[model samples]
Target: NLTEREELAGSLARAIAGGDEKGAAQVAAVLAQHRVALSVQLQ
Candidate 1:
């Protein structure tokens, strides 16, 4: 199993902690997309 989500989460945290607005925003968008993918995958 890959920990891609966890890695992205960590990156998001780091991005926010470091005040990388654009970086954080992009990560958040990707995270949101994954969330939606999960929802659709369950069906």
Candidate 2:
């Protein structure tokens, strides 16, 4: 069973690994468009 988020991330990783230049551009565009923050949950 594929949870929607996992499927989507997997697809994106595949696109990068497979040399999809347009997909690469799209990934950069999305990251540029989002204000995302990464935090460590464990101290």
Candidate 3:
């Protein structure tokens, strides 16, 4: 019974552990995007 946030973060974790060129690229881009979105939303 993972929560919604857990599910979402789990994807991020999956990508981080993915360790290929594709996942690595998205890791930086998606990380910035999600972090910024969360920061602004919480602000």
Which candidate comes out best when scored by lDDT?
Answer: 1
Count of residue pairs whose backbone atoms collide, per candidate: 0, 0, 0
Write one digit per residue (lDDT tens) for candidate 3, span 1-43. 8865445555656665666667656655665665633321221
Model 1, residue 26: C-alpha shift (Å): 0.1
Candidate 1: regions farther than 4 A off: 36-43
Error of 3 at 34 (Å): 8.5
State the displacement of the C-alpha of residue 25, model 3, in Å, after optimal TM-score superposition.
7.6
What would the per-residue lDDT of candidate 1 be over residues 1-43, giving only the tens digit for each residue?
Answer: 6588877877777788899999999998988988833321211
Report the poorest 10 consecutive residues by lDDT, candidate 3.
Answer: 34-43
Backbone clash total for model 2 is 0
Backbone clash tally (model 3) = 0
Judged by whole-model lDDT over C-alpha atoms, candidate 2 comes out at 0.58
Candidate 1 structure, TM-score to reference: 0.74
lDDT of 2 by residue, 1-43 (tens): 9854454455556677789989867765565456333232422
Q: What is the TM-score of each predicted model, taking all chains together?
A: 0.74, 0.48, 0.39
Better of 1 and 3 by TM-score: 1
Q: Measured by TM-score, how close is model 2 to the native structure? A: 0.48
